[PDB]
Amino acid sequence: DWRADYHSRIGEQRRLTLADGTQVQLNTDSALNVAFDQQARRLRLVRGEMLITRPALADSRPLWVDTEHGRLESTLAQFNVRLHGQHTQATVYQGSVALQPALHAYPPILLGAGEQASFNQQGLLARQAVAAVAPAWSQGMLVAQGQPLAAFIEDLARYRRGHLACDPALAGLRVSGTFPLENTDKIIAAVAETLQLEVQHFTRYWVTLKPRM
Amino acid sequence: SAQADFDIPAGPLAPALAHFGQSAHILLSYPTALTEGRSTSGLAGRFDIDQGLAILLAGTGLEASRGANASYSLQASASTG
C-alpha cells in the first residue's frame, strides 16, 4: 500500500521512480495518480502522456494503467500511453501489453513490441506498426514523417501556452523532420521556412501559419 | 560540428532520416516529397554530424544544407558545372 499523485506543467517532462522501482516519465501537461495495493500496481493516467520503462521484473502484482477508456495490463513491457479527448493511444516498444477497453474488456487485445493502437471505451479504433524504440518526446524531440501539418501543430501546441494553428488550405501539408523540444519557436520557424509559409504572430498567444503572398 | 554514434541500418531513406535526426539530436527539416521513395545504405559508426549526414545520403541524389541558424535541411545535390 502506497499512493501518490503527480502532475507536470505545460512544457515539462518529469521522471518518477515508483515504489516498486518501475520508472515513469511524464510528458507535458500530464497528470498521473498511483495506487499500489495487494492486488495490483495501479496507475491512472488522468491527463496527457507517459512512458513506462524499466518495469519491476519480479513484482507478483500486475501493472495496470487505466484511463477513462480502459486498461493496459503490462507484461514486462516498456510502453507509451497518451490520452486524447476521445481515445487512448498505446505504443509498445518492449514486451507486450494487454488492452482491455472499459466496455469490452474481454477478450483482451494483445499488443506486442513495435505495435501502436488507439481505443475508446467501446474498443479498438486504429492499429499500426511502428519502428521507434522509444517515444521521441522522452528524448526531448518531436519526429515527423510526412505528418499532416494540422496534426503536427496539434502535437506541438501541447508543449506551449498559446494557440497554434494553420490556415485550412495548409492542413494536409506533410511535415518531415526532427525537432528538439528545447526551443519550440525554432521548430515553428523551421517548419514554416521549409513549407514556404508565413508565420502570423499578432498577439503573444495566437500563432497562425499562412500561405505566402 | 559535434559527433554522434550512429547505428542506422540500410533501408528506405525517410525512416533512416527520422532515426538520424534523433541520434544526432538536431533540428532537421526538409520537404517530405524530397525524400519519399529513396534508399540509404545506412550509417554505422562515430561521425561528425555533417559528415554522417552526407554518408547517409550517398547515392540518394540529395545533400545536407545549413543556414544562419543551427538547423539542417536537405536539397537536391548541387550541380558541379
Residue numbers in the entry:
A (entry chain R): 111 to 323
B (entry chain B): 48 to 128
The authors write:
Each of these homologous pathways involves a TonB-dependent transporter/transducer, an inner membrane sigma regulator, and an extra-cytoplasmic function sigma factor. Here, we report the 1.56 Å resolution X-ray crystal structure of the periplasmic domain of the CSS sigma regulator, PupR, in complex with the NTSD of the transducer, PupB, revealing a unique fold and topological arrangement of domains. The CCSSD comprises two subdomains: residues 110–238 that we call the C-terminal juxta-membrane subdomain (CJM) and residues 250–324, comprising a Secretin/TonB, short N-terminal subdomain (STN). The CJM has a novel-fold, whereas the STN is structurally homologous to the PupB NTSD.
The final Se-Met and native models include residues 111–323 of PupR, residues 49–128 PupB, 20 tartrate molecules, and 355 or 319 water molecules, respectively. The Se-Met and native proteins have practically identical structures, although there are some differences in interacting residues at the complex interface. The interface between the CCSSD and the NTSD has a substantial buried surface area of ∼1438.6 Å2 and involves residues from the linker, β17 and α2 of the CCSSD and α1 and β2 of the NTSD. The interface is stabilized by salt bridges between NTSD His72 and Glu83 to CCSSD Glu292 and Arg284, respectively, as well as an extensive hydrogen-bonding network. Hydrophobic interactions at the interface include two extensively buried residues, NTSD Leu74 (84% buried) and CCSSD Met251 (98% buried). Interestingly, a polar interaction linking NTSD His72 and CCSSD Glu292 is critical for interaction between the two proteins, but the atoms involved are variable. In the native crystal structure, the Nϵ2 of the His72 imidazole ring forms a salt bridge with Glu292 Oϵ1 and Oϵ2. The Glu292 side chain adopts a different conformer with the closest atom, Oϵ2, shifting 4.7 Å from His72. These results suggest that in addition to the complementary surfaces, a polar interaction at this position is critical to the interaction.
